[PDB]
Amino acid sequence: HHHHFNLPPGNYKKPKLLYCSNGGHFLRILPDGTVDGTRDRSDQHIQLQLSAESVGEVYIKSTETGQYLAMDTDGLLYGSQTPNEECLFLERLEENHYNTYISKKHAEKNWFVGLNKNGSCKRGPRTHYGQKAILFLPLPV
C-alpha cells in the first residue's frame, strides 16, 4: 500500500452526485467522453453509480451514458466505454469527512480525481494530498 485505509461510510446502493467543495461543481461525464464539472444540478450527466470491485476500490459510472470515469497515462480524466485498469479508483475518507478518489493505476504518484475552482478537471500530477480540489461529498440524486 502507498496510501492509508480510512474508508468513508455510505454504500453503493443508489447513484450519487459527486460534489466538489473547491468550486462547488458536480463531477460530470459528457457523452463525448469529456469530463468536467458543472453547478447545474439538473444536468443529466452528473448522476454516477459507484460499485466496489474490492474493498475500497471502485468504478464510477455515468448512469446516463454507461461510461466509466478513467484517468489516462498523462493524468487526464476521460469517459471510457469499457472498464479497464485506468477506471479503478481507491475511495478513501479524507479530513474525517470527505471522499477522495486516487487513481489505482497511478497510486504511487498520488494522482487524484479533482476539480479546479472554474470547473475544469485537474491533471493527475497537479493534484496532491492537502488540496480542496480533491475533496468530494457524495449527494443523493
At 21, the amino acid letter reads S
**Neighbouring residues of 95: CB distance < 8 A, sequence distance ≥ 6:** 135
11 is in an annotated binding site: no
Angle at 85 between CA 81 and CA 86, to 5 degrees: 70
Q: Give the experimental resolution in Å.
A: 1.6
Nearest to 69 by CA among 23, 10, 129, 112: 112
> What experiment produced this structure?
X-ray
Q: Are residues 63 and 29 in contact, defined by beta-carbon separation less than 8 angstroms?
A: no
* CATH class held by domain 1-141: mainly beta
Angle at 39 between CA 141 and CA 57, to 5 degrees: 55
